[PDB]
């Protein structure tokens, strides 16, 4: 029988229909419309709230907390220009305090516009949200964040009016506003996220403000977005040496994000395996999102030294996805807290690399194998990548023939059968009888039949020799 | 499990007419619940060979 | 089986060195410093009577 290929994989169904990929694209466009509809309804509500309190309260002065509540809601929805006359009169009336300034600068980073950018524009990539928030007035919001920081430190000197030459730089309010400044500057452009570890951090050191754990995590996230990993791991190495009790999850989230931008996928594996090992701080769904997206960027990355001679090699990195999802079940990370863009690619890796025991008993049936061949024969133009087009270290002088008796042990049956007539002058050296040298099962019976054929041929040849010359 | 995944996938590139089987000896924590399986005194009427 | 045992062992040497090394880089970060799990702290203070 013709042999079957043992290095050919079993035919199994790993893929989706053209209707299903269209229906995934159609359903994902509906919820992108739903988040676009949800933002503009609430944006129009805060703009109607602004014009109501400006028109009907034209001469009646509002209480300062209502104007403070509307100023943070304007800044959260990306409307920074409608909020700066509100904060300028609240600072002039001296109604703002230490916590109020940190509330306004944290609102200036717009955590309502970033929610629309995440679900609709950035395709649920948490690294791309910082890259896309910098375009909607990134330099303009950074100047007002620097201006409100100068408004804050001027107010803190009034609010602190012993430790008198070391106020307000030694208080908790100075670092809280400085942590609010670095959080707002991360949402700005590339010129301002580069100024966080260099310009803002040295200004905090020159002012003598003691940092906190949220200070270092935003600096590590700022160095993560630049792509500088030799400095980002050094800050956590300072935190691993000195302040190890206060390390939260966001330092690990910066390093998982940072090696994803630098495309060092071997490093981001070791950070995830470290977080599974220590199990403290707890793995957020942002940890599972940043690590699984680094797998998919590594899986869709083409290689160029074999130049894809047979297939894509990096697609084997999606086999780790059932291992990571099994680790999320024990870490307490719910897999339903994953984004819709990532969950389609996670289930893409699951139907390609996962099988159950009930399916493994039925996946090799000849009916399913021959359906795979006919479906490749009928429509292979729709789903194909090709159709689109002693001890040796102390040995040096070896001791040979150490009188080890091979006659105490018994291996007596090593008889070998060679072909008849090797040195015979009548038998030729080359011939088709040379193929008898490669035969193992019938080695004894073939060469004794071959010797009996060659002995009778040389006997009949030499008896024909003696008959012809004796007759003439 | 990354090494167990790599060890199980050696069956796909073995030699001609050569198979393999895998043995795995791992440590696993087992709980002896002394409430589900309590240590009780022997009964007043003990069991015999007829049980 | 002898030539396969040279083929699989060289495969499991280079793979097994890589997985231990990425584990070795995780132990040396855990030995430099870290915060103790409160679920781990509650596991030691769990018995009624100690030694």
């Amino acid at each position: 029988r013709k042999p079957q290929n043992q290095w050919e994989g079993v035919y199994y169904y790993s893929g989706i229909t053209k209707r299903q990929r269209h229906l995934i694209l159609l359903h994902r466009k509906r919820e992108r419309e739903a988040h676009m509809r949800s933002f503009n309804i609430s944006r129009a509500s805060v703009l109607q709230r602004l014009e109501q309190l400006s028109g009907d309260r034209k001469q009646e002065s509002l209480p300062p907390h209502v104007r403070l509540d509307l100023a943070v809601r304007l800044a959260q929805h990306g409307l920074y220009q409608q909020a700066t006359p509100i904060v300028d009169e609240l600072h002039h009336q001296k109604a703002l305090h230490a916590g109020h300034y940190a509330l306004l600068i944290n609102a200036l980073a717009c955590p309502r516009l970033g929610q629309r950018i995440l679900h609709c524009d950035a395709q649920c990539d948490p690294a791309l949200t910082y890259k896309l928030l910098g375009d909607e007035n990134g330099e303009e919001r950074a100047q007002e964040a620097y201006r409100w920081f100068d408004l804050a430190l001027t107010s803190l000197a009034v609010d602190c009016g012993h430790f008198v030459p070391y106020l307000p730089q030694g208080t908790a309010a100075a670092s809280h506003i400085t942590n609010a400044l670095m959080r707002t500057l991360l949402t700005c452009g590339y010129t301002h996220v580069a100024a966080i570890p260099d310009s803002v951090y040295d200004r905090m050191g020159s002012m003598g403000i003691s940092p906190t754990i949220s200070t270092y995590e935003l600096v590590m996230l700022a160095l993560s977005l630049q792509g500088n990993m030799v400095e980002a791991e050094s800050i956590l190495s300072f935190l691993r040496s000195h302040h190890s009790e206060h390390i939260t999850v966001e330092s690990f989230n910066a390093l998982l994000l940072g090696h994803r931008e630098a495309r060092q996928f071997d490093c981001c594996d070791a950070i995830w395996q470290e977080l599974v090992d220590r199990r403290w701080p707890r793995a957020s769904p942002l940890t599972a999102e940043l690590y699984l997206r680094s797998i998919m960027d590594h899986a869709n990355t083409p290689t160029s030294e074999p130049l894809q001679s047979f297939a894509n090699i990096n697609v084997v990195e999606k086999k780790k996805v059932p291992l990571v999802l099994a680790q999320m079940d024990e870490l307490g990370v719910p897999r339903t807290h994953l984004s819709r863009v990532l969950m389609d690619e996670v289930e893409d890796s699951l139907r390609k690399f996962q099988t159950y025991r009930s399916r493994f008993y039925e996946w090799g049936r000849a009916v399913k194998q021959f359906d795979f061949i006919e479906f490749r024969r009928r429509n292979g133009w729709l789903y194909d990548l090709h159709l689109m087009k002693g001890d040796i270290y102390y040995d040096d002088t070896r001791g040979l023939h150490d009188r080890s008796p091979t006659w105490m042990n018994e291996v007596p049956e090593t008889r070998y059968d060679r072909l008849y007539g090797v040195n015979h002058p009548d038998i030729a050296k080359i011939g088709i009888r040379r193929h008898l040298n490669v035969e193992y099962v019938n080695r004894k019976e073939v060469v004794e039949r071959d010797a009996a054929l060659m002995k009778k041929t040389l006997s009949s040849g030499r008896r024909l020799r003696h008959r012809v010359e004796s007759s003439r | 499990t990354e090494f167990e995944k790599r060890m199980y996938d050696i069956r796909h590139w073995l030699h001609r007419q050569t198979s393999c089987e895998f043995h795995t000896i791992y440590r696993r924590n087992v709980i002896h619940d002394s409430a589900v399986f309590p240590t009780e005194h022997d009964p007043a009427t003990p069991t015999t060979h007829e049980h | 089986v002898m030539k396969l045992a040279e083929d699989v062992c060289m495969f499991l040497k280079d793979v097994g060195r890589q997985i231990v090394e990425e584990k070795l880089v995780a132990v040396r970060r855990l030995l430099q410093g870290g915060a103790v799990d409160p679920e781990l702290l509650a596991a030691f203070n769990c018995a009624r009577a100690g030694p």
Binding site: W7, Y11, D384, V438 | - | -
Partner: peptide, 30 residues
């Protein structure tokens, strides 16, 4: 015709059939 036993028994070439052809699940049962 066959492969001899003293030859090295290496894999001749790998086969990627399941990654070139992504087949959807098709069963005759509902």
């Amino acid at each position: 015709y066959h492969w001899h036993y003293n030859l090295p028994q290496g894999m001749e070439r790998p086969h990627s059939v399941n990654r070139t052809f992504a087949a959807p699940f098709q069963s005759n049962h509902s």
